[PDB]
Amino acid sequence: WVVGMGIVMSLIVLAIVFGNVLVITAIAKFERLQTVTNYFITSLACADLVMGLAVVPFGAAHILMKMWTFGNFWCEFWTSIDVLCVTASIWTLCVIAVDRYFAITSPFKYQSLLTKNKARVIILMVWIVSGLTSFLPIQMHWYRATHQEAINCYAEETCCDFFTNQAYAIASSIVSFYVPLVIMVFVYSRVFQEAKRQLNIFEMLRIDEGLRLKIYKDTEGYYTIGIGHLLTKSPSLNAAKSELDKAIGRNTNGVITKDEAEKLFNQDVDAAVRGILRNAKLKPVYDSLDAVRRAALINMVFQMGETGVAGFTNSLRMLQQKRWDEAAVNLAKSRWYNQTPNRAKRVITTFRTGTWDAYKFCLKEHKALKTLGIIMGTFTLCWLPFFIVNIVHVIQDNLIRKEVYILLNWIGYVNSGFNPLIYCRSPDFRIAFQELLCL
Ligand SMILES: CC(C)CCC[C@@H](C)[C@H]1CC[C@H]2[C@@H]3CC=C4C[C@@H](O)CC[C@]4(C)[C@H]3CC[C@]12C
Ligand SMILES: CC(C)CCC[C@@H](C)[C@H]1CC[C@H]2[C@@H]3CC=C4C[C@@H](O)CC[C@]4(C)[C@H]3CC[C@]12C
Ligand SMILES: CCCCCCCC/C=C/CCCCCCCC(=O)OC[C@@H](O)CO
Ligand SMILES: CCOC(=O)c1oc2cccc(OC[C@@H](O)CNC(C)C)c2c1C
């Protein structure tokens, strides 16, 4: 049965190396992925690669042989490297957390304030400082316990149990794990809050309309481009090409850039708003509404125009009277609900709750932030037990077993393999993985 562990432990090392060398190379070779965030992810993957190559294997040999085989020097270095990788990870995660806060609050929503060069420096500092705090206390022997069971393990070359004194145990854990952990959970929950608060009509309509850069057909079969910019009701592609050229002011050939579609969208939302205040029936309702329900109203007029939306006379009467669940029932009784539901259901829910709850993690940059959060969340779950039980061993020392300790450490080790999987949520990372896997 001890063979079982051997296979189990060998399969783990491989997945850590395979997975992480993939992530490293994906970013190194593909420009679409050479961003500040992915620079920090490289720092993360590096730490898990050194973990898999230099750390886990000698952890498996230690367990399976019930002894150290590698002498005192590598015993010390193995420990110092191990601690480094865990520390450099969590601070890198804390940095990712911080960088995303400054991005989401800056007018340049979703893009880092740091330059690529600036990001290289932060990483280098993280590694240098982590390299100090990890190696130095160990080479200088400041970590060491003085009780007999411990001093015996030191003089014995074949023993490499991590015995420390309670002072270092507290000091190392707080500075290495707890401080960057607690900052990261507090800061990143605040980035999640900013994403949701900063949601506006432009992102809303970008979610339930998409962006296509070449001429397509809507669900009605009318020619459309950009973010739901209708070209003509006519069923002639040349008439649609004719309208595009006039709307942009150049020969387009039925294709546009992201810059050109953005100002059509900006004119379209202006128009739907200008329509609202021009219309007799729509004007009052809009004023009565909070900035969120207002956005839902614009959304509709974007899809249907003022005349069509003013037709919901029953429902418009109640949004004005703040009777939210009564309007929502009358909006479901519609051709609009029938025609397209994935989109209507969201709009109605917005009118109902007055919240963005229906649009959570629908935007690409928001899906991107969720992934990062899943990395962070998983790292916490995998390591926290170990570190909690670490510090419980300092207070009442005779409560946690060596078997329990080692096992909780291995729940940590196995975290070095989860990131590459999680990154399969990113479409940019998928296309990258398959190109590299030749598929
Ligand atoms: C002490 C031993 C065991 C581990 C040390 C590994 C060192 C050499 C590695 C781990 C992580 C690495 C960094 C991670 C990725 C960044 C960003 C990249 O755009 C340039 C290189 C740079 C700046 C790397 C420099 C070297 C680095 C610090
Ligand atoms: C004890 C053993 C595991 C240590 C082996 C050292 C390895 C992990 C280090 C030493 C130099 C490092 C590399 C130096 C900089 C490059 C270029 C960068 O664009 C991506 C990271 C990458 C590819 C690093 C990956 C990790 C690396 C290969
Ligand atoms: C159950 C878990 C088992 C996991 C099974 C996986 C293990 C396979 C072996 C990995 C060794 C490491 C190989 C490194 C990865 C090679 C892929 C790669 O990086 O390719 C780049 C190349 O295409 C540039 O052009
Ligand atoms: C016993 C008291 O614990 C710590 O002081 C401590 O602080 C730390 C800070 C960061 C990383 C740490 O390593 C996690 C484990 O993979 C180490 N692998 C063992 C076998 C040494 C530690 C440790 C063990």
Short mmCIF file of C-alpha atoms in Angstrom, two decimals, residues 42-233:
data_model
loop_
_atom_site.label_atom_id
_atom_site.label_comp_id
_atom_site.label_asym_id
_atom_site.label_seq_id
_atom_site.Cartn_x
_atom_site.Cartn_y
_atom_site.Cartn_z
CA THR A 42 4.53 34.23 -13.94
CA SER A 43 6.01 35.02 -10.51
CA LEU A 44 3.30 32.76 -9.05
CA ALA A 45 3.85 29.93 -11.53
CA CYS A 46 7.64 30.14 -11.00
CA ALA A 47 7.13 29.62 -7.26
CA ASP A 48 4.95 26.59 -7.92
CA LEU A 49 7.49 25.23 -10.45
CA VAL A 50 10.36 25.52 -7.95
CA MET A 51 7.96 23.92 -5.46
CA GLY A 52 7.33 20.96 -7.80
CA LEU A 53 10.94 20.58 -8.95
CA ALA A 54 12.95 21.41 -5.79
CA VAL A 55 10.55 20.78 -2.88
CA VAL A 56 7.79 18.20 -3.23
CA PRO A 57 9.99 15.30 -4.53
CA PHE A 58 12.26 15.41 -1.45
CA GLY A 59 9.08 15.62 0.63
CA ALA A 60 7.84 12.35 -0.89
CA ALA A 61 11.19 10.60 -0.37
CA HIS A 62 11.20 11.79 3.25
CA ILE A 63 7.79 10.24 3.94
CA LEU A 64 8.30 7.00 1.95
CA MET A 65 11.74 6.32 3.45
CA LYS A 66 10.80 7.43 7.01
CA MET A 67 14.16 9.25 7.08
CA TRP A 68 16.20 11.99 5.45
CA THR A 69 18.58 10.67 2.78
CA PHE A 70 20.10 13.96 1.58
CA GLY A 71 22.34 15.25 4.40
CA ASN A 72 22.29 18.42 6.51
CA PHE A 73 23.11 21.05 3.87
CA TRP A 74 20.19 20.16 1.61
CA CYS A 75 18.02 19.68 4.71
CA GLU A 76 18.58 23.36 5.52
CA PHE A 77 18.33 24.52 1.89
CA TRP A 78 15.20 22.38 1.22
CA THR A 79 13.47 24.13 4.15
CA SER A 80 14.63 27.64 3.15
CA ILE A 81 13.50 27.10 -0.46
CA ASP A 82 10.16 25.65 0.68
CA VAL A 83 9.35 28.60 2.94
CA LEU A 84 10.48 31.02 0.20
CA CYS A 85 8.03 29.62 -2.37
CA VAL A 86 5.06 29.85 -0.01
CA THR A 87 5.97 33.38 1.16
CA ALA A 88 6.72 34.71 -2.34
CA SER A 89 3.39 33.24 -3.51
CA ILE A 90 1.20 34.88 -0.87
CA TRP A 91 2.84 38.31 -1.21
CA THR A 92 2.57 38.08 -4.99
CA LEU A 93 -1.14 37.27 -4.40
CA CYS A 94 -1.37 40.29 -2.07
CA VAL A 95 0.28 42.42 -4.78
CA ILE A 96 -2.11 41.15 -7.51
CA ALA A 97 -4.91 42.01 -5.07
CA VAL A 98 -3.56 45.56 -4.61
CA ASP A 99 -2.83 46.19 -8.29
CA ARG A 100 -6.44 45.23 -9.22
CA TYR A 101 -7.81 47.68 -6.64
CA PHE A 102 -5.91 50.63 -8.15
CA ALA A 103 -6.93 49.57 -11.68
CA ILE A 104 -10.66 49.29 -10.96
CA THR A 105 -10.77 52.66 -9.16
CA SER A 106 -8.78 54.52 -11.82
CA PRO A 107 -10.59 56.01 -14.85
CA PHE A 108 -8.63 53.35 -16.77
CA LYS A 109 -10.93 50.63 -15.49
CA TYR A 110 -9.37 47.12 -15.66
CA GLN A 111 -5.82 48.19 -16.66
CA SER A 112 -2.91 48.39 -14.19
CA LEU A 113 -1.31 51.73 -13.28
CA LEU A 114 2.05 49.96 -13.26
CA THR A 115 4.25 49.63 -16.31
CA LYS A 116 5.78 46.29 -17.33
CA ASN A 117 9.17 47.50 -16.01
CA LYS A 118 7.64 48.64 -12.70
CA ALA A 119 6.01 45.19 -12.37
CA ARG A 120 9.38 43.44 -12.93
CA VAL A 121 10.79 45.45 -10.03
CA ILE A 122 7.99 44.70 -7.53
CA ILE A 123 8.43 40.97 -8.30
CA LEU A 124 12.21 41.18 -7.83
CA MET A 125 11.72 43.00 -4.49
CA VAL A 126 9.14 40.45 -3.36
CA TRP A 127 11.58 37.64 -4.16
CA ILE A 128 14.64 39.38 -2.65
CA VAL A 129 12.82 40.31 0.59
CA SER A 130 11.10 36.90 0.83
CA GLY A 131 14.56 35.42 0.15
CA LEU A 132 15.90 37.34 3.13
CA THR A 133 13.11 36.44 5.58
CA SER A 134 13.20 32.76 4.50
CA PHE A 135 16.91 31.95 4.14
CA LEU A 136 18.45 34.29 6.69
CA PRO A 137 16.62 33.10 9.85
CA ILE A 138 17.52 29.52 8.86
CA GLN A 139 21.19 29.90 7.95
CA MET A 140 21.64 32.02 11.12
CA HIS A 141 19.90 29.27 13.19
CA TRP A 142 17.47 31.81 14.77
CA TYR A 143 14.62 29.31 14.19
CA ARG A 144 15.92 26.58 16.47
CA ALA A 145 14.23 25.04 19.50
CA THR A 146 16.44 24.16 22.50
CA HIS A 147 14.60 21.14 23.94
CA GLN A 148 16.24 17.69 23.76
CA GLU A 149 14.07 16.08 21.07
CA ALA A 150 15.04 19.01 18.79
CA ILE A 151 18.82 19.35 19.46
CA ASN A 152 19.01 15.62 18.71
CA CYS A 153 17.41 16.10 15.28
CA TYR A 154 19.99 18.82 14.50
CA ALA A 155 23.14 16.82 15.37
CA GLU A 156 21.63 13.89 13.42
CA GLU A 157 22.26 14.20 9.66
CA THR A 158 19.49 11.74 8.86
CA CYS A 159 16.81 13.72 10.78
CA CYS A 160 15.19 16.77 9.18
CA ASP A 161 12.00 17.52 11.16
CA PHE A 162 11.12 21.22 11.20
CA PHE A 163 11.53 22.01 14.91
CA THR A 164 11.35 25.71 15.77
CA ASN A 165 11.11 27.93 18.83
CA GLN A 166 7.75 29.54 19.60
CA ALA A 167 9.04 33.10 18.93
CA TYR A 168 10.12 32.43 15.34
CA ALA A 169 7.00 30.26 14.88
CA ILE A 170 4.85 33.34 15.64
CA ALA A 171 7.14 35.88 13.88
CA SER A 172 7.60 33.94 10.64
CA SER A 173 3.92 32.97 10.33
CA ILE A 174 2.58 36.47 10.87
CA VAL A 175 4.99 38.21 8.45
CA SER A 176 5.08 35.38 5.89
CA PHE A 177 1.44 34.34 5.77
CA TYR A 178 -1.02 36.22 7.95
CA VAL A 179 -0.21 39.82 7.02
CA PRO A 180 -0.38 39.38 3.24
CA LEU A 181 -3.36 37.00 3.67
CA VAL A 182 -5.52 39.41 5.71
CA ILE A 183 -4.67 42.34 3.43
CA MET A 184 -5.52 40.24 0.37
CA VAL A 185 -8.95 39.09 1.64
CA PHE A 186 -9.85 42.64 2.71
CA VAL A 187 -8.55 44.34 -0.42
CA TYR A 188 -9.94 41.87 -2.97
CA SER A 189 -13.43 41.74 -1.46
CA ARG A 190 -13.26 45.53 -1.97
CA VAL A 191 -12.33 45.06 -5.66
CA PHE A 192 -15.37 42.78 -6.04
CA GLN A 193 -17.40 45.62 -4.45
CA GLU A 194 -15.98 48.20 -6.86
CA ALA A 195 -16.68 46.08 -9.96
CA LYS A 196 -20.36 45.80 -8.90
CA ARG A 197 -20.82 49.44 -7.85
CA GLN A 198 -19.06 50.85 -10.94
CA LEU A 199 -21.34 48.87 -13.25
CA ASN A 200 -23.13 51.26 -15.60
CA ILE A 201 -25.41 51.31 -18.64
CA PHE A 202 -22.44 51.03 -21.08
CA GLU A 203 -21.15 47.75 -19.61
CA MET A 204 -24.74 46.56 -19.19
CA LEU A 205 -25.46 46.94 -22.89
CA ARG A 206 -22.06 45.52 -23.77
CA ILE A 207 -22.99 42.34 -21.86
CA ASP A 208 -26.38 41.81 -23.51
CA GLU A 209 -25.54 42.86 -27.08
CA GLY A 210 -21.94 41.73 -27.50
CA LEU A 211 -19.38 43.29 -29.80
CA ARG A 212 -19.00 42.09 -33.38
CA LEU A 213 -16.69 43.97 -35.74
CA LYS A 214 -18.07 42.59 -39.00
CA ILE A 215 -21.69 42.92 -40.27
CA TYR A 216 -24.06 40.39 -38.66
CA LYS A 217 -27.80 39.75 -38.28
CA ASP A 218 -29.85 40.23 -35.10
CA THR A 219 -32.52 37.77 -33.94
CA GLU A 220 -34.98 39.65 -36.18
CA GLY A 221 -32.67 39.19 -39.18
CA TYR A 222 -31.89 42.92 -39.56
CA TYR A 223 -28.30 43.87 -40.45
CA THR A 224 -26.29 44.99 -37.40
CA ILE A 225 -22.73 46.00 -36.46
CA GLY A 226 -20.69 46.90 -33.36
CA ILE A 227 -22.59 46.86 -30.09
CA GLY A 228 -26.09 46.37 -31.50
CA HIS A 229 -26.02 49.24 -33.98
CA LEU A 230 -28.74 48.51 -36.52
CA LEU A 231 -27.77 49.52 -40.08
CA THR A 232 -31.06 49.10 -42.00
CA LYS A 233 -34.42 47.27 -41.92
#
